[PDB]
Amino acid sequence: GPLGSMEDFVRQCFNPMIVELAEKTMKEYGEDLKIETNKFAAICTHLEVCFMYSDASKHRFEIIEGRDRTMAWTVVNSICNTTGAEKPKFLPDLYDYKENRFIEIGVTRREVHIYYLEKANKIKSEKTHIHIFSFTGEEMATKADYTLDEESRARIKTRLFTIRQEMASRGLWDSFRQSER
């Protein structure tokens, strides 16, 4: 059956502005989307989940992901100065003004608990909250505190299911799943 290209998929199935931010992130990292195309789709996916997470509660979150690296640190530093929040060592994805903490969002095709543990071990902060989603509906979050309500998280999981299904229909799912390191 037909095996499509992952680039065609990304440009056809993500919002043009998500695609454009992912292009910038990749350029920022010296990565070529034409060759690392599974990664391009992963970056778009993660951006989109960050935006959906923030949009689940308007004005509650400051968005950090998506910004140019220098601007991202400028915003993290302003938030720390304004709120008294402890400065994180790696750029997080959001800041939650209700619970008063930065959030790292992870999206994975691997087992969620192992990926959660890897993420926690990496940032090593007692303060940054981590919330992981997988493509098959599972999630894991710091202290079993899921931040958003069930319907908000369901909307995100359904979007991830839809991306998986559309990939699989084009023959792209197996390589996308297996490429995560």
- Measured from the CB of residue 22, what is the shortest distance to Mn ion in angstroms? 12
Tokens linked to 126: 């007692």
Which of the residues 65, 118, 149, 151 is marked catalytic?
A: 65
Q: Does residue 65 have an active-site annotation?
A: yes
Q: Which is nearer to Mn ion, 129 or 170 (CB)?
A: 129
- Measured from the CB of residue 106, what is the shortest distance to Mn ion in angstroms? 5
Q: Which is nearer to Mn ion, 10 or 43 (CB)?
A: 43
- Measured from the CB of residue 170, what is the shortest distance to Mn ion in angstroms? 26
Number of H helices, E strands in the chain: 7, 5
Q: Does residue 111 have an active-site annotation?
A: no
**59 phi and psi, to 5 degrees?**
65, 0
Q: Are 38 and 6 within 8 A, CB to CB?
A: yes
Closest CA to 109 of 175, 36, 22, 21: 175
The DSSP code for 170 is T
- Measured from the CB of residue 33, what is the shortest distance to Mn ion in angstroms? 18
The residue written with tokens 């930065």 in the block is 102
Helix (H) or strand (E) holding 131: strand 129-134
Q: Which is nearer to Mn ion, 65 or 170 (CB)?
A: 65
Q: Which is nearer to Mn ion, 48 or 170 (CB)?
A: 48
From CA 45, how far away is CA 176, in angstroms rounded?
12
Specify binding-site residues for Mn(2+). Answer: 46, 65, 93, 104-105
Residues at the contact surface with Mn ion, assessed by CB under 5 A: 65, 93, 105
Which of the residues 7, 8, 93, 99 is marked catalytic?
A: 93
In this structure, the strands spanning 61-63 and 139-141 are unpaired
Catalytic residues: 65, 93
